[PDB]
Amino acid sequence: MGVTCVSQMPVAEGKSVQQTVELLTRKLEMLGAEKQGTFCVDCETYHTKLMYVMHNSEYPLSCFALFENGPCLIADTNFDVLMVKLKGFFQSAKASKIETRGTRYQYCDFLVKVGTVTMGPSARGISVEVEYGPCVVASDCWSLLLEFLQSFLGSHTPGAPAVFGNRHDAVYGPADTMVQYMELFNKIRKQQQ
């Protein structure tokens, strides 16, 4: 929907995973941003062809079903009912609970989803996500998001997202941000630790 930037920043030699998260939240409170609640993105893989059957708490009705690289079905509940019936064409492939859990913040129609990355129970990362509401068209407001990133991150300021290479002049889609989230999951699942 709105243009989103997704990245990781590590512990960065300060205490623990959540210490830098609390530093970012107290920086945002110095700016003075109000909250809108929490958020969590959960993933789960399937295979016979890797099926990413995956969910987000921002849109719980949106059940994302992706290939490894093909089309994405942002489908409803009855698709999840149909998905159970195969069980031989597409095996369960359990133990894929790579999730991002955190809170959302608002500052004058600006939204931030900030939290930590866990492999189920054990947290081994920090997810950083910035976004803006009325960003309809993509690749036209990246100066705004870059300014917002350098405003309060300081170190570990990211840039040039992977879906920005998917250049098109239409409306930015939630699939782009979602793609960014699964690329984030691919970035974090390699190190484990």
Closest to another protein by CB, 126 or 130 = 130
If residue 79 lies in a helix (H) or strand (E), which one and from where to where? Answer: helix 77-83
Alpha-carbon gap, residue 133 to 180, rounded angstroms: 17
Closest to another protein by CB, 37 or 133 = 133
Closest distance of CB 24 from another protein, Å = 18
Q: At what angle do helices 17-31 and 142-152 cross, to 10 degrees?
A: 110
Closest distance of CB 105 from another protein, Å = 13
Alpha-carbon gap, residue 49 to 33, rounded angstroms: 43
Alpha-carbon gap, residue 180 to 5, rounded angstroms: 8
Closest distance of CB 109 from another protein, Å = 5
Closest distance of CB 134 from another protein, Å = 6
Which residues lie near another protein (CB under 8 A)?
1, 107-110, 133-137, 140-141, 143-144, 147, 169-171
Alpha-carbon gap, residue 135 to 192, rounded angstroms: 34
Alpha-carbon gap, residue 150 to 143, rounded angstroms: 11
Closest to another protein by CB, 13 or 169 = 169
Closest to another protein by CB, 10 or 173 = 173
